């Protein structure tokens, strides 16, 4: 392969990327080799023709975070006599996760959100969690 | 101490780790993920960069480390015209 | 009233410009209205005497490309009052450009602008290439950095 | 004072720096620390010339003026083997394409 803009099939790629992503958010293991390759995938995706799959990758990632923070909302929703402490463990987790994604999506961050209301992958993660917190900020009566 | 960068055609470049970190992309690659980045197995494989480009990238790393924060007269960084395009793409990709 | 401009401090300052870079350097004085004014260029191994004033603003660029240069390790040079009659030095040096910025320089120097888009490089780089070094843009940037 | 080098053997290259005043043997030590093969199994060359253990890099022809960070001097490397001594082979880098018309 080469650094030049390539003809690239999206879903073939967003699948393997997806497996790795959900791995990364919950702090489960990622083998470093495939981590390297995921970097190379987000590149190829960002440069591909006929139309650049930058934006599409952004929105697929955003839906992924919505489902995941809402799912965190539902998993911590199960009281377990433990709101907050559950909330906390999950937020520690999800935060280091968001950091590692911010790392992995670097090129999408630097070169695509120069175009522009879009925000960096990490920051986005944070807004999603700010709806997990805006929801119990309301349920505080 | 040292990291091994692999070019697309299989060439191995061993450079000081601190130098390789000049690359935001490489810094990010080894930032991850981020556990057991100390299992003594540190290497990067670039399946998009040819050896004639990775060699210059490494020369840039050495150049970069030497002249930043040095009060010595800083010289121009040379780029042969036939590699200018490939280097631009590699520099873009590696973020350095 | 602009932010980045010289103040007409009627207090003289002797300066010697030293080009310790390999570029032909074009010195630029920001007058009292913040407008950039060009001065005679300098070859790579030369120095030059200047009668400036405390509080005047100067910046330096590649004469042919308008690439940014450093003076005493920074973007801007401001003469201060001379100590013990020792003239104040303004050292022009190359900065250490990012590899990408350096590649953009070489490529801009080799391809005519009307051809940037005919190059077989990633799409995004076209915009980067067209965004050639600009003193006015630097002034806008420096004004922002200044205030905040 | 520093000379910047790339020590190469069989599609392998090590980027490293050294003092013009240091000896060849010390370079073999750097190589031992990186590739894990002792000095008595190493032969270093500059243009098919075997470099003597006791000579300094300056005495070998390396000068800070030629071995620069951005344009390092190349040092060839060969290994001793099972009762025998290897023949130096440095695999060449790849080649760029023909310069495109627009840059002409």
Swiss-Prot record, chain A:
Coiled coil segments of this chain: none
Compartments, as annotated in UniProt: Nucleus
Post-translational modification summary for this protein: Neddylated; which enhances the ubiquitination activity of ECS (Elongin BC-CUL2/5-SOCS-box protein) E3 ubiquitin-protein ligase complexes. Neddylation leads to structural rearrangment in the complex that allows interaction between the E2 ubiquitin-conjugating enzyme and the acceptor ubiquitin. CBC(VHL) complex formation seems to promote neddylation. Deneddylated via its interaction with the COP9 signalosome (CSN) complex.
Quaternary organization: Component of multiple Cul2-RING (CRL2) E3 ubiquitin-protein ligase complexes consisting of CUL2, Elongin BC (ELOB and ELOC), RBX1 and a variable substrate-specific adapter; this complex is also known as ECS (Elongin BC-CUL2/5-SOCS-box protein) complex and may consist of CUL2 or CUL5. Component of a ECS(VHL) or CBC(VHL) complex containing CUL2, RBX1, ELOB, ELOC and VHL. Component of the ECS(MED8) complex with the probable substrate recognition component MED8. (Microbial infection) Interacts with human respiratory syncytial virus (HRSV) protein NS1.
Comment, domains: The Cullin neddylation domain restrains the RING domain of RBX1 in the E3 ubiquitin-protein ligase complex; this restraint is removed upon neddylation of the cullin.
Family affiliation: Belongs to the cullin family.
Protein name per UniProt: Cullin-2
Lineage: Eukaryota, Metazoa, Chordata, Craniata, Vertebrata
UniProtKB/Swiss-Prot annotation, chain B:
Domain of life: Eukaryota
Keywords in alphabetical order: Host-virus interaction, Nucleus, Transcription, Transcription regulation, Ubl conjugation, Ubl conjugation pathway
Entries under SUPFAM superfamilies matching the protein: POZ domain
Record's subcellular location: Nucleus
Membrane-spanning intervals of the chain: none
Post-translational modification: Ubiquitinated by the DCX(AMBRA1) complex, leading to its degradation by the proteasome.
Function: SIII, also known as elongin, is a general transcription elongation factor that increases the RNA polymerase II transcription elongation past template-encoded arresting sites. Subunit A is transcriptionally active and its transcription activity is strongly enhanced by binding to the dimeric complex of the SIII regulatory subunits B and C (elongin BC complex).
Quaternary structure, from the entry: Heterotrimer of an A (ELOA, ELOA2 or ELOA3P), ELOB and ELOC subunit. The elongin BC complex interacts with EPOP; leading to recruit the elongin BC complex to Polycomb group (PcG) target genes, thereby restricting excessive activity of the PRC2/EED-EZH2 complex.
Family: Belongs to the SKP1 family.
Record protein name field: Elongin-C
Species this chain originates from: Homo sapiens (Human)
Gene designation per UniProt: ELOC
UniProtKB/Swiss-Prot annotation, chain C:
Keyword tRNA processing: no
Consequence of substituting residue 96 to G: In VHLD; type II
Consequence recorded when altering residue 53 to H: In VHLD; type IIA
Outcome reported for the amino acid change (mutating residue 52 to N): In VHLD; type I
Effect of residue 21 to R: In VHLD; type I
Effect of residue 84 to E: In VHLD; type II
Tissue specificity: Expressed in the adult and fetal brain and kidney.
Disulfide bond entries: none
Mutagenesis or variant effect for residue 97 to D: In VHLD; type I
Region (Interaction with Elongin BC complex): 98-107
Phenotype upon changing residue 9 to W: In PCC and VHLD; type II
Effect listed in the UniProt record for changing residue 30 to H: In lung cancer
Associated clinical condition: Pheochromocytoma: A catecholamine-producing tumor of chromaffin tissue of the adrenal medulla or sympathetic paraganglia. The cardinal symptom, reflecting the increased secretion of epinephrine and norepinephrine, is hypertension, which may be persistent or intermittent. von Hippel-Lindau disease: VHLD is a dominantly inherited familial cancer syndrome predisposing to a variety of malignant and benign neoplasms, most frequently retinal, cerebellar and spinal hemangioblastoma, renal cell carcinoma (RCC), pheochromocytoma, and pancreatic tumors. VHL type 1 is without pheochromocytoma, type 2 is with pheochromocytoma.
Family according to the record: Belongs to the VHL family.
Name recorded for this polypeptide: von Hippel-Lindau disease tumor suppressor
Location of this fragment in the whole protein: 60 to 207 of 213
Curated annotation (Swiss-Prot), chain D:
GO function term, MF aspect, one: transcription corepressor binding
Statement: the UniProt record of this protein carries the keyword Nucleus: yes
GO biological process: positive regulation of proteasomal ubiquitin-dependent protein catabolic process; protein ubiquitination; protein-containing complex assembly; target-directed miRNA degradation; transcription elongation by RNA polymerase II; transcription initiation at RNA polymerase II promoter
InterPro entries to which the protein is assigned, alphabetical: ELOB, Ubiquitin-like_dom, Ubiquitin-like_domsf
Sites bearing N-acetylmethionine, chain numbering: 1
SMART domains named in the record: UBQ (SM00213)
Functional pathway: Protein modification; protein ubiquitination
Main location class: nucleus
Subcellular location: Nucleus
Residue ranges annotated for the Ubiquitin-like domain, each copy included: 1-66
Presence of the UniProt keyword Nucleus in the record: yes
Classification via CDD domains: Ubl_ElonginB
Function: SIII, also known as elongin, is a general transcription elongation factor that increases the RNA polymerase II transcription elongation past template-encoded arresting sites. Subunit A is transcriptionally active and its transcription activity is strongly enhanced by binding to the dimeric complex of the SIII regulatory subunits B and C (elongin BC complex).
Family, per entry: Belongs to the Elongin B family.
Protein name: Elongin-B
Source organism of this protein record: Homo sapiens (Human)
Gene designation: ELOB
